[PDB]
């Protein structure tokens, strides 16, 4: 069973969102496929359902601005949302319950934000190791994420090989309404000429992709 | 509607302790309940459905009981795989509807900060702009305090700063601030300190550079 939607990004108030929920590993002719929403450090939400015989139900305090429909020899569920609010702003989700009682298996989520300002892409800038970011035999370097929007931005070091130590931390808004994030990592200190790190961002909502390489200064 | 609330918002346990998660019904739901488990960056999983039931693959020392209004999740023996927040929802009437989650964190030894501190790149100062970063390195609590110095003047309102959710191979946590000054503002100063309050710490402990070193 897998659940596969859609990327995600920005769009206007008042206008309308659209998600796409892939299927596989079952039927849309035998299961029913709901969205719910998480706003983005708050609870779950649930939007509404379109059950395998193709009826729907929804929130009722969304119900005039929802519609889920579905396409079973795609195995697609769309949702559509329109007079878009600032607060609708969340992170989405197609789930169902399966063969279960709850919400066994769930889509990765789509994270669309609500705003008038613009997509950018991220400038990145290395974090250099120093004396001043060593301790021992551990040294921390890093890479700054700055002045993207809207969220999300992943970030991995050496494509992904290099988990361990790595800390990513939550994006704060500046005034200038973009997002800015670290992420760093630490490694022993006698390592710092001898490895290559490489910081990898990716911003989906403007197919930004960088990779920072880290070193050390003189 | 049928309003679920949650409670405590947030708890602190020692590992091996015993967890109990509490949630509550405005309505009758009768068995219609579940339980779920979500991490930084995951999506939500399926812990525990029709009040009482583990779904496939959970541990067994997650178990869901109650009936009604009253329900509850315990964790037998906590373990730091657990770290999490922990949300219930109701599916015995439309509109399905959930609480506002529960935060599960660990207790463990004090641990005083690691303090390290990044000056800006020069390819960030190419283009007009300075951010300056202080990293605090795998503490225990959570509550600390960054204060930053330039040329020994106490800086305000320049500053955002950002934590990580716990750590579940060390339960412990790190610390981010930013200080972002214009090109023309960094250029004039020489010394760039951020001093760091911690109750691991004796002493408030100072990390430094020079701007001409
Ligand atoms: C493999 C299989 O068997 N597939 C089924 C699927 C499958 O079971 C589901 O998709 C889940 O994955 O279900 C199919 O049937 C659907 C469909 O028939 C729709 C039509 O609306 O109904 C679905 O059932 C839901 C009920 O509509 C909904 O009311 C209940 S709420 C939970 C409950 N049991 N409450 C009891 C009291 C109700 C509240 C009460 N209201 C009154 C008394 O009026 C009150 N006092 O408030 O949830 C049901 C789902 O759990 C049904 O599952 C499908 O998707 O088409 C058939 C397919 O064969
Ligand atoms: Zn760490
Ligand atoms: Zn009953
Ligand atoms: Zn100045």
């Known amino acids: 069973v897998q659940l596969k939607q859609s990327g995600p990004g920005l769009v206007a108030p008042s206008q309308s969102l659209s998600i796409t929920c892939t299927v596989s590993?079952?039927?849309?002719?035998?299961?029913?496929v709901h969205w719910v929403r998480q706003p983005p450090g708050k609870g779950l939400e649930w939007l509404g359902v379109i059950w395998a015989v193709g009826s729907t139900n929804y929130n009722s305090a969304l119900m005039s601005r929802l519609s889920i429909s579905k396409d079973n020899s795609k195995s697609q569920v769309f949702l559509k949302m329109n007079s878009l609010q600032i607060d609708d702003t969340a992170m989405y989700y197609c789930?169902?319950?399966?063969?279960?009682?709850?919400?066994?298996?769930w889509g990765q989520g789509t994270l669309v934000t609500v705003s008038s300002a613009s997509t950018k892409g991220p400038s990145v800038f290395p974090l250099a190791p120093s004396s001043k970011s060593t301790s021992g035999g551990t040294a921390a370097l890093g890479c700054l994420v700055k002045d993207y929007f809207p969220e999300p931005v992943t970030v991995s070091w050496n494509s992904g090989a290099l988990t361990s130590g790595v800390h990513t931390f939550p994006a704060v808004l500046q005034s200038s309404g973009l997002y800015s994030l670290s992420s760093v990592v630490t490694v022993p200190s006698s390592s710092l000429g001898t490895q290559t790190y490489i910081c990898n961002v990716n911003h989906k909502p403007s197919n930004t992709k960088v990779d920072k390489k880290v070193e050390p200064k003189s | 509607d049928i309003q679920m609330t949650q409670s405590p918002k947030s708890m602190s346990m020692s590992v091996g302790e015993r967890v109990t998660l509490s949630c509550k019904a405005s309505?009758?739901?009768?068995?219609?309940v579940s339980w779920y488990q979500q991490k930084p960056e995951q999506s939500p999983k399926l812990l525990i459905y029709?009040?009482?039931n583990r779904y496939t693959g959970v541990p067994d020392r997650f178990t869901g009981s109650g009936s009604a209004t009253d329900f509850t999740l315990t964790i037998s023996s906590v373990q730091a795989e657990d770290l999490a927040d922990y949300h219930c929802g109701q599916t015995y009437t439309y509109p399905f509807t959930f609480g506002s989650g529960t935060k599960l964190e660990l207790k463990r030894t004090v641990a005083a900060p690691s303090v390290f501190i990044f000056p800006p790149s020069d390819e960030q100062l190419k283009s007009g702009t300075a951010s300056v970063v202080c990293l605090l390195n795998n503490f225990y609590p959570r509550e600390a305090k960054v204060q930053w110095k330039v040329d020994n003047a106490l800086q305000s309102g320049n500053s955002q700063e950002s934590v990580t959710e716990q750590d579940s191979k060390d339960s412990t946590y790190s610390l981010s601030s930013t200080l972002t000054l214009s090109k023309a503002d960094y250029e004039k100063h020489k010394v760039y300190a951020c001093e760091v309050t911690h109750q691991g710490l004796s002493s408030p402990v100072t990390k430094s550079f020079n701007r001409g070193e």
């Open positions: 590993g079952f039927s849309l002719t035998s299961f029913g």
């Open positions: 029709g009040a009482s």
């Open positions: 309505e009758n739901v009768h068995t219609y």
């Open positions: 789930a169902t319950y399966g063969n279960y009682g709850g919400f066994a298996y």
